[PDB]
Design an enzyme around this catalytic site. Structure first.
Site, PDB file in Angstrom:
ATOM      1  N   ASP D  43     -47.370 -36.718 -11.162  1.00  0.00           N
ATOM      2  CA  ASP D  43     -47.474 -35.649 -12.142  1.00  0.00           C
ATOM      3  C   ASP D  43     -48.315 -36.108 -13.333  1.00  0.00           C
ATOM      4  OD1 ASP D  43     -45.745 -37.244 -13.732  1.00  0.00           O
ATOM      5  OD2 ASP D  43     -43.984 -36.225 -12.925  1.00  0.00           O
TER       6      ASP D  43
HETATM    7  C1  LIG Z   1     -39.221 -49.265 -27.873  1.00  0.00           C
HETATM    8  C2  LIG Z   1     -39.350 -47.761 -27.803  1.00  0.00           C
HETATM    9  C3  LIG Z   1     -39.641 -47.115 -29.132  1.00  0.00           C
HETATM   10  C4  LIG Z   1     -39.830 -45.622 -29.069  1.00  0.00           C
HETATM   11  C5  LIG Z   1     -38.682 -44.878 -28.435  1.00  0.00           C
HETATM   12  C6  LIG Z   1     -38.867 -43.384 -28.402  1.00  0.00           C
HETATM   13  C7  LIG Z   1     -37.792 -42.635 -27.660  1.00  0.00           C
HETATM   14  C8  LIG Z   1     -38.020 -41.147 -27.579  1.00  0.00           C
HETATM   15  C9  LIG Z   1     -36.926 -40.394 -26.864  1.00  0.00           C
HETATM   16  C10 LIG Z   1     -37.195 -38.909 -26.703  1.00  0.00           C
HETATM   17  C11 LIG Z   1     -38.470 -38.616 -25.977  1.00  0.00           C
HETATM   18  C12 LIG Z   1     -38.517 -37.240 -25.381  1.00  0.00           C
HETATM   19  O1  LIG Z   1     -37.715 -36.845 -24.570  1.00  0.00           O
HETATM   20  S1  LIG Z   1     -39.850 -36.261 -25.991  1.00  0.00           S
HETATM   21  C13 LIG Z   1     -39.505 -34.654 -25.228  1.00  0.00           C
HETATM   22  C14 LIG Z   1     -39.822 -34.615 -23.751  1.00  0.00           C
HETATM   23  N1  LIG Z   1     -39.452 -33.345 -23.144  1.00  0.00           N
HETATM   24  C15 LIG Z   1     -40.324 -32.542 -22.525  1.00  0.00           C
HETATM   25  O2  LIG Z   1     -41.520 -32.814 -22.451  1.00  0.00           O
HETATM   26  C16 LIG Z   1     -39.768 -31.278 -21.904  1.00  0.00           C
HETATM   27  C17 LIG Z   1     -40.801 -30.482 -21.138  1.00  0.00           C
HETATM   28  N2  LIG Z   1     -41.047 -31.035 -19.814  1.00  0.00           N
HETATM   29  C18 LIG Z   1     -42.228 -31.493 -19.417  1.00  0.00           C
HETATM   30  O3  LIG Z   1     -43.245 -31.394 -20.102  1.00  0.00           O
HETATM   31  C19 LIG Z   1     -42.288 -32.162 -18.050  1.00  0.00           C
HETATM   32  O4  LIG Z   1     -41.038 -32.009 -17.387  1.00  0.00           O
HETATM   33  C20 LIG Z   1     -42.659 -33.655 -18.093  1.00  0.00           C
HETATM   34  C21 LIG Z   1     -42.083 -34.371 -16.866  1.00  0.00           C
HETATM   35  C22 LIG Z   1     -42.058 -34.310 -19.341  1.00  0.00           C
HETATM   36  C23 LIG Z   1     -44.176 -33.837 -18.116  1.00  0.00           C
HETATM   37  O5  LIG Z   1     -44.810 -32.726 -17.413  1.00  0.00           O
HETATM   38  P1  LIG Z   1     -45.267 -32.915 -15.873  1.00  0.00           P
HETATM   39  O6  LIG Z   1     -44.050 -32.642 -15.011  1.00  0.00           O
HETATM   40  O7  LIG Z   1     -46.370 -31.899 -15.653  1.00  0.00           O
HETATM   41  O8  LIG Z   1     -45.758 -34.346 -15.770  1.00  0.00           O
END
Ligand SMILES: CCCCCCCCCCCC(=O)SCCNC(=O)CCNC(=O)[C@H](O)C(C)(C)COP(=O)(O)O
Ligand SMILES: COC1=C(OC)C(=O)C(C/C=C(\C)CC/C=C(\C)CC/C=C(\C)CC/C=C(/C)CC/C=C(\C)CC/C=C(\C)CC/C=C(\C)CC/C=C(/C)CCC=C(C)C)=C(C)C1=O
Ligand SMILES: CCCCCCCCCCCCCCCCCC(=O)O[C@@H](COC(=O)CCCCCCCCCCCCCCC)COP(=O)(O)OC[C@H](O)CO
Ligand SMILES: CCCCCCCCCCCCCCCCCCCC(=O)O[C@H](COC(=O)CCCCCCCCCCCCCC)COP(=O)(O)OCCN
Ligand code: SF4
Lengths: 43, 324, 80, 87, 112, 54, 385, 181, 54, 157, 94
Positions: D43
């Site tokens: 993906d």
């Molecule tokens: C040491 C580390 C330091 C930093 C740590 C940071 C931690 C952050 C934690 C939170 C991060 C999140 O969830 S950030 C929010 C993430 N949530 C989303 O993106 C929901 C929508 N879904 C989508 O876009 C797709 O399911 C997706 C598979 C994601 C991509 O698309 P594809 O399917 O087309 O590949």
């Protein structure tokens, strides 16, 4: 009208003015007074 | 020469005691101005306080931070302390009371003063701390800046005397103390001495509360004590130099038999004590300049005035043929 | 001879000169007063019985108020 | 003599290995022309992951407005094989 | 620089997600240096943990929730990098470097 | 503005006239009695309302 | 630009002061304070307290001007309760507020002076501070955290002889102010450290929410004691000093003059002090006398209620502000009808003033940063809460 | 300029869609507005000749868990020109960003950081929006009603690691809640 | 009881709150004249002493 | 050893006299307790007269006074400063906040006693302790220092 | 005579020994600022000025008017340099 420009310089730079006066006396005495004293001694 | 070390110790040890008690006297006078007592518990009237503080310092563990300048870090306080000590070899306390009767003694004192900057510079650089380095650079710049005015005032006295011998400088004031005709020069000399010894109102290393870290901030135990002792010995020396050059050294105030009864060393000591009291008093009376302000004062005020006094004194003495 | 090392005790001995003895407590601590005006007329102090190892907690309750100017009653009047 | 570009064959092998051992790529669809999305079951998040992996292995950052075109192994190797910052 | 407006839809929110993921991954070498992890864990495991955190929230459909999650992730990354609190096997909120679970919990305590 | 006032300003600046007053009134307190309390033989004043150990 | 991280871990410069400065040589390009080092969750704690139990939190915010914050909180509670305070209590409140202002100004002025190297004024001023602490202790039994001013008036009446001793203090305080001034005001070093340092325009002061001396230094005539008077301030004569240059020197002079005006107010309060009650007479909100509670059922019941549950405050919300020594100190109080505050937001002037440090210190020398901090009069108990 | 004049003049002059609720009371004049009009309302009040509301005294949040938009953001403002105070309020929830007013009142910068730290409300176009009061890496928003008084973690020196470390809290004597209601 | 702490009949004695003016201090001409005369006469004395030393 | 013990005890008495007569505290001025500490150093009580001089750098300090509330944010800074203090060193906890968290004990941001971060030698109670109470605490510190027998313990080790 | 310098050397040796004893007994129980270069240059110049002043000051009785005016010319050149530095802002640390 350079008679209050000197006034303003003295008011704003008292240290420089005092230094100029002190050093100027130190230069004036040998330049002017010393030859006078030497002349009065010859006669 | 076998008795020379005894004379040297008879100079150095009472000087160290005098420094230890100068610290106490500063505390006492500062307190009394501030309507308090200052040290009066450790010994009677606090007279054992310096010994206790020195004992505490020697019994304190040394730190020696993990720097790459291990040798230089410990040698800097040694350098400044030794330089503070060695200036006293040429200081006369009375007629014939001097370890080394140097004909070039005035220039020797100037050389020692010029050497004093290296302990501070090396302490700042070797400590591996940007704050200490910056503070050391500023302090070094201030000392070299005021050294120029000190040298020019020295030249004024030399013009009056015609010899670099400190005892001759004293005996040339039998007719009149140089501080009377050259009183503004004496004021300039005292202020320049304050600035040269990093003393209030010029004490940048004491301005920690002003976000200005001192050059000795990383030092502990006896390296820090060596820096402190050298500074206070230099204060005593500057007071002695003010006494020698302008207040007639060991000479009495008036050439009368009543005044000639009391020994010359006592006259010299009393004048030195007056100047040390003025050191403390000034620290008690005023706030401090910023670095930029004091640098401006060093280059813009004291240098031009010192040079002008050199010119005026030399011109006047040449004109009327009053040279030595 | 404790005056030479203990400057704190020396100050009390000096200021005891001319003082009035107000009382002694059960531990032997002695209480003095001057009746002058230097610290706004506050001239009460205690000479502890132990010339070494004296400690502020050795003042008993009957004299604590007098020493701290909380009351004008001495330890003796409170105990009676 | 000293050069400024990594060899094409070396970059090809490096990118091929990086894609082969990634997480979800069986080392049987990985051809020097294989596309990330259509032919590798990856993906967009995983393709961004792979491109970020390309950055670590060659020690330099690929512009965001340039990574959008690296979609297969051939476009990748075309990019890194001529970039002077590649190491 | 300033806090952007809320994402209007899922496309721009996904773009912000990709930007945050790139910024988080590019900061991995700095984190490895700061926490001295060379002999503790591989950089790819850090990348994998970040991506797993992104994937566990892949069911979110509200762009505002995604924007808030991205903002919180940025703050957590900033605190990890700028104001590191070194522990040993733990960076921030992540651990770095024949009986069922019921029996273990029962042996542990009465509060599961 | 005037030679006299400019002269008086110059002298005051050169002779540190205002620095003298600070020195003088610092010296006046030097001879006055001190306010220090000789703790623990002497104590500070407290009131019957003082909130100390329960 | 290099970055100097300055944290003085000692009360020479605050104690929890932490500054990140960007420098171009010795010139300050940007000053960034890092705060929260004294954030203790006061506003959260207050929500778990009755209105009486919350009162001591206010002594510990600007812990150099204790009774002023007590006063502000009491005023907010009185406002929500519609409670009438007796006149004698009003006068005592104002008297103690002005004593507090003197306590604050002495500390602020002399700690700033010590920071820029003038050591003696600190000792001189702290002896006078000790005399004023004695008045605090004589009325409350505490030198600092009196918890003396309360909703409805004051905790206890003045002990006999206190007014006479305060009068004795006032008879000599002007000479002490004069000594501080002669030490500082005309000295060329003091002027060189303060003149044209930290200049603030009136527009800047309004934009950054400045108050108190920080606002009046810029020529804005604004003092809450006159703009929004409270207690007996409208019966009292005093002047409001304002600056003309908006720099550190003007603010120093304003603080000196404010001490003089506070002395004036104290003298007037001493002379106009009336007899009568020191607590509001509404028997649902104030403690009965000890003898009443030991003699009368109604009194006992009220005492039990007051010290267990506390009084209720009808549901409402309001912002109440006073002219604290450091500027406008405000409380946004939200009541839900119960015996505990639902929300208590504390508006501290130091929070606004320290936020202004960046624009105030721009393009100044490193050594001027401490001067600007001193002229702001920052206490982190109120900045952080 | 009294609170009767402000109420009447604001009714006559403000655009109607800006204000949903207007309260006149001795507890303060109060205007409630939707989040999308807060910025424009404050700019109007600051700039208009007859209001000249130049000082932003503070911004604070209030948590109302029983409400769909649980947070209420309160703006306390002052007119030194007319010696008057105004309160302007708007509601918010956990995910909806509201406009920053830093460009109107520079003093808002830190008050907005505080609202974000304490309650979790975010501010559009705020130049530097990070926590300001809590410890670095703090989790949660302490002034929310559901946040526990003692929090979730505490710190102690750990000799084996030679550092201060954070662990889940353990209370020797728990906070006792006395319910007098 | 019915006795409360307050002012005496007639109130307290008036107290000053404004700054008191101390004094001008030494004259500028006087200081200029003292320093100049000391310089001139003292340098003459320096010459005399130098002659004797010679 | 009828002669070695006497000399050892004399040496230890000298060491204790030096260390009690010159105590150089560094002040951790955190909150209101720092004001009472300032009063202790002022003219009325004059800590200088006991040989107590306050130092800016932990490197020149023998004692740390923790005067005020310690937050979780500040704790690492306090510990690092303590770790720069050269031996021998002592810690005085001043006021309820430093002693056990005081009025802030149940807060989410406050360390419940500085003795969770550094070893404490003397606890001075009060909120704030009076200046005289702090002076009494410092005299208790002297009492503790005067039980040291460093030379004797090392001779026997 | 150089005899008087020997006590100075012995004094240095003793002072060094005192330093070592005092220091050794406790072991038993990237921002270039040009203004520093400039102040160094100014100090160098006026250091040489003092250097040249010393022999002149002791020799005034013998060199008389010619030596006085030659030193005055020296000082005039150096003071023109000083005026140049002053105008250019080398003496300002703000
Ligand atoms: C040491 C580390 C330091 C930093 C740590 C940071 C931690 C952050 C934690 C939170 C991060 C999140 O969830 S950030 C929010 C993430 N949530 C989303 O993106 C929901 C929508 N879904 C989508 O876009 C797709 O399911 C997706 C598979 C994601 C991509 O698309 P594809 O399917 O087309 O590949
Ligand atoms: C607060 O400011 C102050 C300081 O800076 C912080 C001080 O260092 C100090 C004290 C520093 C000193 C007392 C140094 C004194 C050192 C000496 C007199 C010379 C050595 C004296 C000793 C007792 C060491 C003895 C060493 C031996 C090997 C014993 C054999 C002889 C004081 C009092 C002070 O007030
Ligand atoms: C900061 C101070 C600045 C001062 C600047 C002003 C003065 C600068 C020097 C100007 C030259 C001299 C001007 C003074 C005029 C009076 C000269 C005078 O009085 O004549 C005397 C003579 O003065 C001189 O001749 C000295 C002149 C000084 C040299 C100045 C240099 C001029 C050009 C030199 C050319 C060399 C090339 C220059 C290299 C750079 C008489 O002496 P005598 O012949 O009776 O006996 C000699 C003496 O007493 C015994 O040793
Ligand atoms: C028996 C007693 C002996 C006592 C000996 C010591 C005397 C005490 C000395 C210490 C006094 C207090 C020291 C603390 C003050 C230090 C701060 C000095 C600041 C300073 O130098 O200011 C400069 C003027 O002073 C100066 O320039 C100082 C030099 C003055 C020399 C006078 C030069 C002309 C005299 C007239 C001679 C004429 C007769 C000969 C023909 C001008 O700088 P600024 O920035 O502060 O400006 C602002 C002016 N308000
Ligand atoms: S113990 Fe009391 S006086 Fe001391 S810092 Fe804590 S709240 Fe303030």
């Amino acid at each position: 009208p350079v008679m209050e420009k000197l006034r303003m310089f003295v008011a704003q730079e008292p240290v420089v003015a005092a230094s100029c006066l002190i050093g100027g006396v130190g230069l004036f005495l040998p330049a002017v007074v010393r030859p006078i004293l030497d002349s009065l001694e010859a006669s | 020469y076998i008795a020379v070390p005894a004379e040297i110790l008879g100079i150095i040890l009472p000087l160290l005691l005098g420094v230890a008690f100068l610290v106490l006297a500063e505390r006492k006078v500062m307190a009394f101005v501030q309507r308090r007592k200052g040290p009066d518990v450790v010994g009677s009237f606090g007279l054992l306080q310096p010994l206790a503080d020195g004992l505490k310092l020697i019994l304190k563990e040394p730190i020696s931070p993990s720097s790459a300048n291990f040798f230089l870090f410990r040698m800097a306080p040694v350098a400044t302390f030794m330089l503070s000590l060695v200036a006293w070899a040429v200081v006369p306390f009375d007629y014939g009371m001097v370890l080394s009767d140097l004909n070039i003694g005035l220039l020797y004192l100037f050389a020692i003063s010029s050497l004093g900057v290296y302990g501070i510079i090396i302490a700042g650089r070797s400590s591996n701390s940007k704050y200490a380095f910056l503070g050391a650079l500023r302090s070094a710049a201030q000392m070299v800046s005021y050294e120029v005015s000190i040298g020019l005032i020295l030249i004024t006295v030399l013009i009056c005397v015609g010899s670099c011998n400190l005892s001759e400088i004293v005996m040339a004031q039998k007719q009149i103390w140089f501080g009377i005709p050259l009183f503004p020069v004496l004021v300039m000399f005292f202020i320049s001495c304050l600035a040269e010894t990093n003393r209030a109102p010029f004490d940048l290393p004491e301005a920690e509360a002003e976000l200005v870290a001192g050059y000795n901030v990383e030092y502990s135990s006896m390296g820090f004590a060596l820096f402190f002792l050298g500074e206070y010995a230099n204060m005593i020396l500057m007071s002695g130099l003010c006494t020698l050059f302008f207040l007639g050294g060991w000479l009495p105030i008036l050439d009368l038999p009543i005044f000639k009864k009391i020994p010359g060393s006592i006259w010299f000591s009393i004048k030195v004590l007056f100047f040390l009291f003025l050191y403390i008093w000034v620290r008690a009376a005023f706030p401090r300049y910023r670095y930029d302000q004091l640098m401006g004062l060093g280059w813009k005020v004291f240098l031009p005035l010192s040079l002008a006094w050199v010119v005026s004194v030399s011109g006047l003495l040449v004109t009327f043929q009053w040279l030595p | 001879m404790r005056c030479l090392p203990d400057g704190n005790l020396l100050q009390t001995k000096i200021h005891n000169i001319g003082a009035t003895l107000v009382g002694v407590d059960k531990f032997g601590n002695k209480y003095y007063q001057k009746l002058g005006d230097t610290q706004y007329g506050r001239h009460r102090w205690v000479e502890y019985a132990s010339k070494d190892r004296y400690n502020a907690s050795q003042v008993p309750a009957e004299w604590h108020g007098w020493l701290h100017f909380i009351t004008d009653h001495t330890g003796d009047e409170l105990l009676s | 003599v000293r050069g400024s570009f990594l060899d094409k064959s070396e970059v090809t092998d490096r990118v091929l290995s990086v894609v082969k051992n990634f997480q979800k790529v069986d080392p049987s669809k990985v051809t020097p022309k294989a596309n990330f999305q259509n032919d590798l079951g990856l993906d967009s998040l995983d393709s961004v992951e792979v491109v970020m992996a390309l950055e670590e292995e060659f020690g330099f950052e690929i512009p965001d407005n340039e990574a959008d075109k690296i979609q297969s192994i051939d476009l990748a190797v075309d990019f890194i094989a001529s970039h002077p910052q590649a190491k | 620089i300033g806090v952007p407006p809320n994402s209007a839809n899922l496309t721009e929110a996904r773009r912000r997600v990709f930007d945050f993921f790139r910024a988080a991954c590019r900061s991995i070498p700095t984190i490895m240096d700061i926490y001295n992890l060379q002999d503790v864990v591989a950089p790819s495991q850090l990348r994998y943990a970040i991506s797993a955190q992104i994937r566990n929230n892949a069911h979110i459909t509200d762009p505002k929730v995604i924007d808030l999650l991205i903002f919180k992730g940025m703050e957590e990354l900033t605190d990890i990098v700028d104001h590191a609190k070194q522990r040993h096997h733990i960076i921030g909120q992540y651990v770095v470097g024949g009986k069922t679970d019921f029996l273990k919990n029962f042996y542990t305590s009465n509060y599961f | 503005k005037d030679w006299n006032t400019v002269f008086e300003r110059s002298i005051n600046t050169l002779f540190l006239t205002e620095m003298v007053r600070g020195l003088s009134l610092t010296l006046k307190y030097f001879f006055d009695p001190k306010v220090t309390i000789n703790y623990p033989f002497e104590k500070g004043p407290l009131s019957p309302r003082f909130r100390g150990e329960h | 630009n290099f970055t100097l991280n300055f944290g003085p871990q000692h009360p020479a410069a605050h104690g929890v002061l932490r500054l990140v400065l960007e420098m171009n040589g010795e010139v300050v390009e940007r000053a960034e304070p890092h705060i929260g080092l004294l954030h203790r969750g006061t506003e959260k704690l207050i929500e778990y307290k009755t209105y009486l139990q919350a009162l001591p939190y206010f002594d510990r915010l600007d812990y150099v001007s204790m009774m002023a914050q007590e006063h502000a909180y009491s005023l907010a509670v009185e406002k929500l309760l519609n409670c009438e305070v007796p006149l004698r209590a009003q006068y005592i409140r104002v008297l103690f507020c002005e004593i507090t202002r003197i306590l604050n100004h002495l500390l602020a002025l002399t700690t700033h002076a010590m920071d820029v190297g003038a050591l003696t004024p600190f000792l001189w001023a702290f002896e006078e501070r000790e005399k004023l602490l004695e008045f605090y202790e004589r009325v409350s039994g505490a030198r600092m955290h009196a918890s003396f001013i309360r909703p409805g008036g004051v905790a206890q009446d003045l002990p006999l002889g206190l007014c006479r001793d305060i009068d004795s203090f006032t008879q000599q305080f002007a000479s002490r102010i004069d000594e501080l001034e002669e030490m500082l005001t005309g000295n060329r070093i003091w002027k060189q450290r303060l003149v044209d340092i930290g200049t603030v325009t009136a527009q800047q002061a309004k934009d950054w929410g400045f108050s108190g001396v920080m606002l009046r230094g810029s020529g804005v005539c604004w003092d809450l004691r006159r703009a929004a008077p409270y207690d007996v301030y409208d019966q009292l004569d005093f002047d409001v000093p304002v600056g003309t240059r908006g720099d550190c020197y003007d603010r120093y002079c304003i603080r000196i003059e404010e001490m003089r005006q506070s002395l004036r107010i104290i003298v007037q309060c001493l002379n106009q002090m009336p007899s009568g009650m020191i607590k509001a007479d509404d028997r649902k909100l104030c403690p009965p006398s000890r003898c009443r509670m030991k003699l009368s059922m109604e009194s006992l019941i009220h005492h039990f209620e007051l010290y267990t549950e506390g009084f209720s405050v009808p549901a409402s919300s309001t912002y109440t502000a006073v002219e604290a020594p450091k500027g406008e100190f405000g409380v946004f109080l939200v009541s839900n009808g119960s015996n505990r505050p639902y929300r208590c937001k504390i508006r501290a002037p130091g929070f606004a003033h320290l936020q202004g440090l960046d624009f105030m210190s721009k393009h100044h020398m490193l050594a001027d940063v401490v001067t600007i901090i001193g002229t702001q009069d920052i206490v982190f108990g109120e900045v952080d809460r | 300029m009294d609170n009767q004049f402000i109420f009447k003049y604001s009714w006559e002059t403000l655009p109607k869609k800006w204000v949903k609720k207007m309260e006149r009371s001795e507890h303060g004049n109060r205007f409630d507005t939707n989040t999308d009009y807060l910025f424009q309302l404050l700019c109007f009040l600051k700039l208009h000749t007859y209001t000249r509301v130049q000082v932003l005294i503070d911004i604070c949040g209030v948590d109302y868990p029983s409400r769909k938009r649980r947070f209420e953001v309160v703006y306390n403002l002052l007119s030194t020109r007319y010696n008057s105070r105004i309160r302007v309020q708007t509601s918010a929830d956990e995910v909806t960003r509201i406009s920053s007013v830093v460009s109107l009142f520079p003093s808002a910068g830190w008050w907005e950081r505080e609202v974000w730290d304490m309650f979790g409300v975010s501010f559009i176009n705020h130049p530097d929006l990070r926590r300001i009061l809590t410890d670095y890496g703090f989790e949660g928003h302490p002034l929310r009603k559901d946040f526990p008084l003692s929090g979730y973690v505490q710190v102690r020196y750990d000799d084996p690691e030679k550092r201060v470390v954070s662990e889940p809290i353990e209370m020797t004597q728990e906070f006792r809640y006395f319910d007098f209601a | 009881p019915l006795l409360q702490d307050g002012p005496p009949p007639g109130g307290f004695a008036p107290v000053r709150y404004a700054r008191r003016i101390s004094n001008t201090g030494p004259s500028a001409m006087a200081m200029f004249l003292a320093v100049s005369g000391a310089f001139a006469w003292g340098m003459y004395q320096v010459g005399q002493g130098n002659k004797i030393r010679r | 050893s009828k002669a070695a013990e006497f000399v050892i005890s004399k040496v230890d008495d000298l060491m204790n006299w030096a260390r009690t007569g010159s105590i150089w505290p560094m002040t951790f001025g955190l909150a209101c307790c720092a004001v009472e500490m300032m009063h202790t150093g002022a003219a009325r009580y004059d800590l200088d007269r006991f040989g107590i001089i306050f130092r800016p750098s932990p490197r020149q300090s023998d004692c740390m006074i923790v005067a005020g509330t310690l937050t979780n944010k500040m704790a690492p800074a306090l510990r690092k400063v303590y770790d720069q203090m050269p031996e021998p060193r002592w810690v005085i906890s001043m006021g309820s906040c430093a002693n056990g968290g005081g009025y802030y004990h149940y807060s989410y941001s406050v360390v419940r006693g500085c003795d969770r971060i550094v070893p404490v030698d003397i606890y001075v109670p009060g909120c704030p302790p009076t200046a005289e109470a702090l002076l009494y605490g410092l005299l208790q510190l002297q009492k503790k220092i005067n039980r040291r027998k460093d030379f004797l313990h090392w001779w026997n080790k | 005579m150089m005899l008087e310098f020997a006590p100075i050397f012995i004094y240095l040796v003793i002072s060094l020994l005192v330093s070592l004893i005092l220091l050794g007994v406790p072991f038993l129980f990237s921002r270039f600022d040009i203004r520093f270069y400039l102040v160094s240059i100014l100090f160098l110049i006026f250091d040489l000025e003092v250097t040249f002043f010393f022999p002149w000051a002791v020799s005034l009785n013998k060199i008389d008017l010619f030596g006085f005016w030659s030193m005055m010319a020296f000082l005039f050149i150096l003071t023109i340099g000083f005026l140049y530095e002053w105008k250019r802002g080398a003496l300002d640390w703000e």
